[PDB]
Amino acid sequence: MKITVIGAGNVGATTAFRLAEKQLARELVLLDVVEGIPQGKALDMYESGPVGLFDTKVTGSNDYADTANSDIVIITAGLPRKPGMTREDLLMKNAGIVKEVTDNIMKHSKNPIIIVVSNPLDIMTHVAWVRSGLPKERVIGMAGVLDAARFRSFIAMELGVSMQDINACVLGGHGDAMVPVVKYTTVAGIPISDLLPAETIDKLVERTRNGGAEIVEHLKQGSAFYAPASSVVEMVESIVLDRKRVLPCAVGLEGQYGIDKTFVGVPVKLGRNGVEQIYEINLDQADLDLLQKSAKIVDENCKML
Amino acid sequence: MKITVIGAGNVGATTAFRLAEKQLARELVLLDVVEGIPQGKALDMYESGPVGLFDTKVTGSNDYADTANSDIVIITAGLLLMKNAGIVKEVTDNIMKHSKNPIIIVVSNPLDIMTHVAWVRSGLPKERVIGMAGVLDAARFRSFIAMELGVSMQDINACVLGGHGDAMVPVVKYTTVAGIPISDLLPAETIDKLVERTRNGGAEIVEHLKQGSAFYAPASSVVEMVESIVLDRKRVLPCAVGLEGQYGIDKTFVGVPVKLGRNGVEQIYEINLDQADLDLLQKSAKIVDENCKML
Amino acid sequence: MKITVIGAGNVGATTAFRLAEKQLARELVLLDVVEGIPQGKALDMYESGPVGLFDTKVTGSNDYADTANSDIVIITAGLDLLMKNAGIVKEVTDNIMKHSKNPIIIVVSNPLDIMTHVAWVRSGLPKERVIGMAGVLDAARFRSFIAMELGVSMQDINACVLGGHGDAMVPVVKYTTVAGIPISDLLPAETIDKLVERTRNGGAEIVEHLKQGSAFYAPASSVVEMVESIVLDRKRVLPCAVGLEGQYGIDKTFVGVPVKLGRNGVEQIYEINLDQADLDLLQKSAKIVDENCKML
Amino acid sequence: MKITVIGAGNVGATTAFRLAEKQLARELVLLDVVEGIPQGKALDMYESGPVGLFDTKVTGSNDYADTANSDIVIITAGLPRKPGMTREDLLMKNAGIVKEVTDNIMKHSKNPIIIVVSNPLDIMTHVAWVRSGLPKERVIGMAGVLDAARFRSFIAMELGVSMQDINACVLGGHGDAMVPVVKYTTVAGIPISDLLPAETIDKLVERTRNGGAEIVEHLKQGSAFYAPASSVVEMVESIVLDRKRVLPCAVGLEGQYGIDKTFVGVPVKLGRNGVEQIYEINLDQADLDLLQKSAKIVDENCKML
Ligand SMILES: NC(=O)c1ccc[n+]([C@@H]2O[C@H](COP(=O)([O-])OP(=O)(O)OC[C@H]3O[C@@H](n4cnc5c(N)ncnc54)[C@H](O)[C@@H]3O)[C@@H](O)[C@H]2O)c1
Ligand SMILES: NC(=O)c1ccc[n+]([C@@H]2O[C@H](COP(=O)([O-])OP(=O)(O)OC[C@H]3O[C@@H](n4cnc5c(N)ncnc54)[C@H](O)[C@@H]3O)[C@@H](O)[C@H]2O)c1
Ligand SMILES: NC(=O)c1ccc[n+]([C@@H]2O[C@H](COP(=O)([O-])OP(=O)(O)OC[C@H]3O[C@@H](n4cnc5c(N)ncnc54)[C@H](O)[C@@H]3O)[C@@H](O)[C@H]2O)c1
Ligand SMILES: NC(=O)c1ccc[n+]([C@@H]2O[C@H](COP(=O)([O-])OP(=O)(O)OC[C@H]3O[C@@H](n4cnc5c(N)ncnc54)[C@H](O)[C@@H]3O)[C@@H](O)[C@H]2O)c1
């Protein structure tokens, strides 16, 4: 198992390190455009192996040749969104980044599984997909796991119960595009609406909606990376160990939810072959409406490309 | 078990995060002098819990009141001797105002010297104030040998005494692969380079990073020490501790093998060093000693 | 942290070994009434330490003095079945209390609900510190069968199971899900019924295969999950056997319900909204558990 | 990765369970001749996955068809030295068991790595090897790791130091055939001769020599299985994760230590290809003599087979 992580920033490096430690791959390549950084971090990670008890070969590079024949490729290239940036501005920029990166990895890696993390997630996962030339089942984006994670931690603070016993159902994208399904959000199998007032739930849902902005507001510069990295790894783990986890990821639909082709966040079974099954849950009218509406917006922006 | 990490920078946050998922403490508090950074990083970590499967209560803060009654305090605060000494001095006086008997692990460079500063400020028995350094050097020495011989790092033991760089004293006779001395597996010339690369290991990362320093190995090294103490494992690890004669060195803090348990330093090991290594070790001790004097 | 495991049999030893590796205690004492068995198994476990990378001090013994001041004590001692095991749990508990003043006691010995009650009254401890393992295991089985049916990770399946073992077991279907999705949404009524039934007879299914003895790997893992919540103060919400004081219309009786496990033991008892059939099933059982206890 | 464990007894089952939890294989098969036991134990293991957090498909069987195409096969079949068995008697019985099993697995698996645990180890590993018809590099036995593990635990009790910082060099076989190399037995790199008196060291070496008997002495019936299981898994892990661990194992030599084709316990580097390197350590005259001497014993026993 060989894994390549494109982008040696906060999210890419944190992800590479976690992957190295869990020994999910014998070879891990950390690539970036800037010379130095990937070489440095990768070496720093490897040098921790004596203590972490892992022999994962972690190397840094600036040459896509080193990524040759990767079984899985994680794209975290780009840059968050400096304060004051425009939606369309970031879209064009990152669309370029993701396209360049994707064309490059396909030049040295055929049939890999691509996991996209770059923002705007839904569109970028689409972009990566179209450039990859692979079946949609091999290109997936990380977003829902992270939103579900924040949602769960907030519910945990509210009730004082372990986060391991909380399920948060989150479909769609981020911000107004996020579609949290309170109906399938449980605590030990019990729906949260059975336990908490609608008013409290609304607050938890909104904090989840702007969860990233909350981190940003504290860090002053940059953005969240521990939860995002952990989330990326959970997906990578299901694929490497063929666990068949059911996680909300950005995948290309083909009819489900009255949506076609567009990349939308939905519960899917992840295995060694990528998206092995897409679940179409019984959303309420409003949620299903928001989901179709947001997917339509994505469809538009994808034409702008 | 309540652990407090001072300094929410690269090593401190990386450490707190590893600490959080290993569930070595029920309460973990990240403190920094800058507002927002610790609160933000701590939240990011906590939000990782649903996925990392841990419930550790990680909180960020700028108020030492939140560090009250800490069992272990890790000081990673710092930007050199003069500036970090003031920082370590300020941090130590603050933690002691809210924690009466913690075990303090210092990582702020210059290590041996800073460890000494924290020790004197804390007013604690030297068995409860140690510095991290040797574990990291040993880890680097180990990864290089692993690259050289193509074997698992888990089966390599690297003995490293002294401080960093020139003051570092790797003991070749006690450096092995599956119990076999390296001088039995490699040309004395290759052993010299591996040794030198270990001496300049920290600078090798810096050069690559261009900004800041290494933190993944340093963080992992710190946690191994924390774990031995928390789980009372009695690991034998080289750390910076106050000597009382061993190696012909007294008072000064120096990197030597020690048995780490729930009570901190429960034993200092004095290994038979040859003339060359003992000379170096002592030489460095006096250097560390002059600096502490001028402080 | 000092944990004592009573009964060095299949469940007790498997539990001790798991505990030793996870390093949830500095001291782990395996005690049995049979000479040599615990000493041997504990030594074998300790010798695994260089490989499992743990330094947990696991020791075997036939002397309760070695269990002194234990924070947590796990009772797996047991070989009519009601009377014999009741005698054993009685003897074990009284012995435990002569050397430990305030431990958290986790009972595993069958018949669970009842043995948990026995241990509780003999211990003289607050009921929040005496619990029995049962629901976690039934739920684990219920979850493993669903995974076989749907081909999904067991980590994303939540099975709600209240009550005791066998016909006393009350699996709540509406609170059993896959990624938050009710199984009734994913499986036919018939398939769900068979899975529920296989869960009811889960224990006998293993026994039938082993001829002698019963399951121990899932039972041990289940116990450890409970111990971990307490040791690490995780506040997990797990179905365990505990003494009720009105919840579900049941009083005094020990029965399996969801509880919040923390460093202080049972920190909260959850009373979920059961449908009429399940609520009556739960109450029926509890009354049976209550009769047996009265006769003891 | 598919792994088969022949024998559902204490060491076989304990090994299967550990393998399942570590997720070292997506498929684990437990086979035995007795109907029931393997099915029951295997089901019990799988039913713990919801709690152990693994999805390893663990199945029990009495049909070698199920072991089809196993990447690794672990032989733990047998039932050695009763309270008065003959070294000869045990040798013949287990020799037939190991061959019957090896022939069976080769009919359903063509290029699997075989790891033997059945006693007498060195001899049974030789048997399995000849039958398998595979290169000697893919047939190894477990013995040195266990003796080394015991040796370390004893040194730990003696000095009050973590077992993780103790290295124990043990070559050869068990009992009289065991060749502990005090010279390469360390604590944080320090030779134990630098730390303990020759008198204490000898006591430690002899306890290691009769370590299995000490367990038997307490259990009254059967024998050790936790340490043995853990040892087998450490080897399996190095192979699966291609860690390149250096562990004392029973492998077919080809010259080193002045020993030819016989299986002897020596430090070897284990990777995905099995025995990737045999280390010939600088033993002292006495130890070197014991090694060749015992090796001869083995040759004599294999001859009359
Ligand atoms: N999926 C989510 O919900 C989620 C969560 C967090 C962050 N993100 C997004 O992930 C990205 C990375 O976040 P970060 O915090 O790690 O950022 P960062 O700025 O720390 O790191 C990005 C890295 O990308 C590299 N890079 C830029 N252009 C490149 C190119 N053409 N090729 C190769 N490498 C290139 C940079 O040099 C940099 O090291 C951002 O776009 C951010 O908005 C998404
Ligand atoms: N012991 C070793 O072998 C070793 C290895 C690596 C780094 N280090 C040292 O550790 C320190 C931290 O390294 P880093 O990479 O994390 O640095 P960094 O620059 O990323 O972070 C340092 C953090 O300290 C904080 N800080 C400064 N003054 C403070 C004060 N008075 N109180 C509380 N917080 C304060 C900053 O605001 C910053 O967030 C440095 O001194 C470095 O040289 C030692
Ligand atoms: N709660 C559950 O869901 C669950 C699951 C599995 C097993 N169990 C029950 O747990 C018990 C143990 O199961 P097992 O498979 O380990 O059995 P086992 O027969 O393997 O072991 C029982 C051990 O108890 C010891 N013992 C007997 N009397 C004792 C006494 N007075 N004091 C101390 N030790 C004594 C024996 O000597 C023996 O080593 C049984 O009663 C069984 O039915 C309950
Ligand atoms: N390598 C070491 O240092 C070491 C350590 C411990 C045990 N061992 C050896 O490992 C073996 C197993 O130990 P155990 O404690 O698990 O014993 P055990 O008696 O509990 O189990 C042996 C299992 O082998 C099965 N079996 C017998 N003949 C078989 C055949 N032809 N095919 C398939 N299965 C068969 C039995 O039915 C039984 O379940 C013994 O030979 C023992 O001496 C070696």
Strand residues in chain B grouped as ranges (E)? 2-6, 27-31, 57-61, 72-75, 103-106, 129-131, 156-157, 160-162, 168-170, 176-177, 180-181, 235-244, 250-261, 264-268
Q: Considering only alpha carbons, which residue of chain C is nearest residue A282?
A: C185
Atom of ligand 4 nearest to the CA of D12: 16
Q: Considering only alpha carbons, which residue of chain B is nearest residue D191?
A: B174
Distance CA B258, CA D222 (A): 41
Tell if the CB–CB gap between C151 and A186 is shorter than 8 Å: no
- What is the least distance, in Å, from the CA of D246 to any CA of chain B? 6
Q: Determine the 3-state secondary structure of C178 from DSSP.
A: strand
Distance CA A16, CA A38 (A): 10
Distance CA C86, CA D250 (A): 50
Query: Considering only CA atoms, which of C140, C139, C156, C150 is closest in space to residue C185?
Result: C150
Contact A37, A12 (CB under 8 A): no
CA A42–ligand 4 middle distance (angstroms): 45
Residue A165 DSSP label = G
Contact B3, B226 (CB under 8 A): yes
Does residue D11 have a known ligand-binding role?
Answer: yes
- The neighbours of chain C, by the rule of 3 or more Cβ pairs under 8 Å, are A, B, D
Extract the tokens encoding C240: 């365990």
Query: Considering only CA atoms, which of D77, D60, D21 is closest in space to residue C210?
Result: D60
Residue B234 DSSP label = -
Tell if the CB–CB gap between B234 and D194 is shorter than 8 Å: no
φ/ψ (deg, to 5) at D169: -95, 115
Distance CA A157, CA B57 (A): 10
Breaks, C-N > 2.5 A, in chain A lie after: none
Extract the tokens encoding D279: 């280390």
Which ligand is closest in space to the CA of residue A5? 1
- Supply the Cα-derived Rg of chain D in whole angstroms: 19
CATH of C1-134, one of 3.60.15.10, 3.40.50.720, 3.40.50.10490, 3.50.50.60: 3.40.50.720
| Locus of tokens 């190696």 | B247
Residue B66's Cβ-count burial label (10 Å; 0-12, 13-18, 19+) is middle
Give me the resolution in angstroms, 1 decimal: 2.0
**What is the CATH code of the structural domain delimited by D1-143?**
3.40.50.720
Using CB atoms, which residue from A181, A189, A279 is nearest to C158?
A189
D120 cis-preceded (ω within 30 degrees of 0): yes
Q: Chain A contacts of C50, Cβ < 8 Å? A: none
| Locus of tokens 């198994």 | C41
Contact D218, C40 (CB under 8 A): yes
Contact D202, C38 (CB under 8 A): no
* H or E element, residue D252: strand D245-252
* H or E element, residue A74: strand A72-75
A215-250 core/surface letters (b: 16 or more CB in 10 A; e: else)? bbebbeeebbbbbbbbbbbbbbbbbbbbbbbbbbbb
Using CB atoms, which residue from B26, B233, B234 is nearest to C233?
B26
Best residue among B107, B135, B209 to mutate for probing ligand 2, ranked by most atoms within 8 Å of CB: B107
CATH class of C135-295: alpha beta
How long, in residues, is chain C? 296
Extract the tokens encoding B104: 């303090």
Distance CA A186, CA C258 (A): 14
Distance CA C68, CA C87 (A): 22
SS3 content of chain B, % helix, strand, coil (to 5): 50, 20, 25
Contact C161, C139 (CB under 8 A): yes
φ/ψ (deg, to 5) at A149: -60, -50
Check pocket membership of C216 for ligand 3, CB cut-off 6 A.
Answer: yes
Q: Determine the 3-state secondary structure of D113 from DSSP.
A: strand
Distance CA B49, CA B22 (A): 11
Using CB atoms, which residue from A37, A145, A220 is nearest to B209?
A37
Extract the tokens encoding C224: 């450890």
Residues 6+ apart with CB under 8 A from A182: A169, A191, A192, A193, A201, A205
Tell if the CB–CB gap between A242 and D23 is shorter than 8 Å: no
Q: How was this structure determined?
A: X-ray
The residues lining ligand 1, judged by C-beta closer than 6 Å to any ligand atom, are A 6-12, 32-34, 37, 76-80, 97, 100-101, 117-119, 121, 142-143, 146, 222-225, 228
The residues lining ligand 2, judged by C-beta closer than 6 Å to any ligand atom, are B 6-12, 32-34, 37, 76-78, 84, 87, 90-91, 107-109, 111, 132-133, 136, 212-215, 218
Check pocket membership of C134 for ligand 3, CB cut-off 6 A.
Answer: yes
Supply the residue whose CA is at minimum distance from atom 18 of ligand 3. Answer: C9
The residues lining ligand 4, judged by C-beta closer than 6 Å to any ligand atom, are D 6-12, 32-34, 76-80, 94, 97, 100-101, 117-119, 121, 142-143, 146, 222-225, 228
Pair type for strands D166-167 and D139-141 = unpaired
CATH class of B1-133: alpha beta
Query: Considering only CA atoms, which of C292, C290, C126 is closest in space to residue C282?
Result: C290
CA atoms within 13 A on the CB side of D33: 10
Pair type for strands A27-31 and A2-6 = parallel
**What is the CATH code of the structural domain delimited by D144-305?**
3.90.110.10
- The neighbours of chain A, by the rule of 3 or more Cβ pairs under 8 Å, are B, C, D
C111 cis-preceded (ω within 30 degrees of 0): yes
Tell if the CB–CB gap between A51 and B217 is shorter than 8 Å: yes
Helices (H), chain C: 10-22, 37-46, 49-52, 81-97, 112-123, 135-150, 183-186, 189-200, 202-210, 217-231, 276-295
Distance CA D83, CA D86 (A): 10
B110 cis-preceded (ω within 30 degrees of 0): yes
Distance CA C99, CA D119 (A): 43
CA A163–ligand 1 middle distance (angstroms): 28
The 3-state secondary structure of A203-267 reads HHHHHHHCHHHHHHHHHCCCCCCHHHHHHHHHHHHHHHCCCCEEEEEEEEEECHHHCEEEEEEEE
A174 is catalytic: yes
Residues 6+ apart with CB under 8 A from B164: B109, B110, B111, B133, B137, B199, B202
How long, in residues, is chain A? 305
Contact A186, A164 (CB under 8 A): no
Domain ranges of chain C: 1-134, 135-295
**Planar angle of CA B20, B22, B23, nearest 5 degrees:** 65
Distance CA C71, CA B285 (A): 45
Using CB atoms, which residue from B23, B231, B233 is nearest to C232?
B23
Distance CA B108, CA B197 (A): 22
| Locus of tokens 């783990």 | A237
Q: Determine the 3-state secondary structure of B186 from DSSP.
A: coil
Residues 6+ apart with CB under 8 A from C64: C31, C95, C96, C98, C99
Q: Chain C contacts of D156, Cβ < 8 Å? A: 49-50, 55
CA D94–ligand 4 middle distance (angstroms): 9
Q: Chain D contacts of C136, Cβ < 8 Å? A: 51
Residues 6+ apart with CB under 8 A from B179: D167, D168, D169, D181, D184, D185, D186
Mutate: best of A47, A61, A165, partner B, most B CBs <10 A: A47
Please measure the distance between the N-terminal and C-terminal CA atoms of chain A and give it in whole angstroms: 34
Distance CA C45, CA C55 (A): 11
Using CB atoms, which residue from C156, C235, C272 is nearest to A162?
C235
Which ligand is closest in space to the CA of residue A33? 1
DSSP states of D6-74 as a string? Answer: E--SHHHHHHHHHHHHTT--SEEEEE-SSSSHHHHHHHHHHTTHHHHT---EEEEES-GGGGTT-SEEE
Distance CA B263, CA B232 (A): 8
For the annotated catalytic residues of D, the residue numbers are 174
**What is the CATH code of the structural domain delimited by B134-294?**
3.90.110.10
Contact C55, C49 (CB under 8 A): yes
CA D267–ligand 4 middle distance (angstroms): 25
DSSP states of C219-265 as a string? Answer: HHHHHHHHHHHHHTT--EEEEEEEEEESGGG-EEEEEEEEEEEETTE
